[PDB]
Amino acid sequence: IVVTVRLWDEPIAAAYRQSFAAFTRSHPDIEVRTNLVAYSTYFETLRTDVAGGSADDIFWLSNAYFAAYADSGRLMKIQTDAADWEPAVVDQFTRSGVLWGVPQLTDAGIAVFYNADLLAAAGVDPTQVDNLRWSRGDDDTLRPMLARLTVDADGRTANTPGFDARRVRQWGYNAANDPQAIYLNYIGSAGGVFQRDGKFAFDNPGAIEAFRYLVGLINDDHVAPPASDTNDNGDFSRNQFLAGKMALFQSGTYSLAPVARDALFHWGVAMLPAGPAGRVSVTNGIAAAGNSASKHPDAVRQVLAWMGSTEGNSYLGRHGAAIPAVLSAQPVYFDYWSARGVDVTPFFAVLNGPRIAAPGGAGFAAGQQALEPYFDEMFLGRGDVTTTLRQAQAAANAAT
């Protein structure tokens, strides 16, 4: 009996092959085969295959797309215990009171890389960075911390008279037109939404609050790089962090590999700052769904059970590049990194409260491209956040 597993990441396909070889040794009635399809056309192809009965037994879904499949009965109900799976990914795949996929991988949450040498030089202990709060009111603690951490070529900090924003040598932070690392967390941390019911919905009080704050950090405080540096250069801030030029660099686990490889100074990871509604990180996960039209539904059930076990899911995290969604399997990931001198807890701890889903779905790419020029102007400090969001929303939706 052959069960086929469909997915889109190659290194993970390698890890699956190692996982399923271990499965078949304890369950030799079943051979599992992986089937790579490139990310760029995965969903358009899965849509055709599912629709006409030739999709694989097991396939990867994201949050963006599973809904259409779940409603039309394409997907098996995941009828197991869920206490050992990331709650974030579990919620991501629950619809009408049913779990529709076995959680496989998670992004985890956003955190704050810091350059400890640059903290030491400014008189800041790394623990201080874990208790920061952003706000439009006078309960804010982020801004003065970023100000202390932003230095011009004369040694004048951002809050000092004389400070020259043209001559900044060291930025405190990476506030920028950068959804995943920055503004999606600000919106959620303000109680706003970015997307609702497959439509862009960021024209709302919370998002207004978030964008005013960010606009201010960049154009008025000068504690993050100018928007011309970062609008359409997604890597600018990370490169400045690597060059020893940025105190705090707010990002996800995707920057762990690029940071560990090249960073020559002492560094760590601290918590996401809290907003008016707490520390709310963007997150996103991947689940493996069972095909309801599978020729061998029992064997699929055995394979899904293994994929969701400590032992099976451990394989995806053993290389420290993808994070297991099984909670008991995640120490393979922590260990990978602790041995390389990095504590990864803040990326995980942040999930322990409320969250915002990574936006996605049909017509999203096109919508995201359409809002882009308006967001660029907004981060350039031009016009008004209010008027910009209203026009950007109408434009994003039209394109969708």
Author numbering: 39 to 438
What is written in the article reporting this PDB entry?
UspC from Mtb is a 441-amino acid protein that has been previously identified in bioinformatics analyses as a putative active importer of carbohydrates across the inner-membrane of the Mtb cell wall. The uspC gene forms part of a putative three-gene operon, uspABC, of which uspA and uspB encode the membrane-spanning subunits of the transporter, while uspC is a homologue of ABC transporter-linked solute-binding proteins. The fold of UspCNt follows the architecture of periplasmic binding proteins for bacterial ABC transporters, consisting of two subdomains or lobes that enclose the putative carbohydrate-binding cleft in the centre of the molecule. In conclusion, our data strongly indicate that Mtb-UspC is a carbohydrate-binding unit of the essential UspABC transporter system, with a substrate preference for sugars containing an amino group at the C2 or C3 position.
UspCNt crystallized in two different crystal lattices. An initial model of UspC was generated using ARP/wARP, extended manually (COOT) and used to determine a molecular replacement solution for the monoclinic crystal form (PHASER). The conformational flexibility of UspCNt revealed by the comparison of the monoclinic to the tetragonal crystal form highlights the potential for structural plasticity between the two domains, which may be functionally significant in ligand binding and is comparable to previously reported carbohydrate-binding domains of ABC transporters, which undergo an opening/closing motion upon ligand binding, exemplified by the structures of GacH. Comparison of molecule B of the monoclinic crystal form of UspCNt with the tetragonal structure demonstrates that UspC possesses the capacity to undergo a similar closing motion.
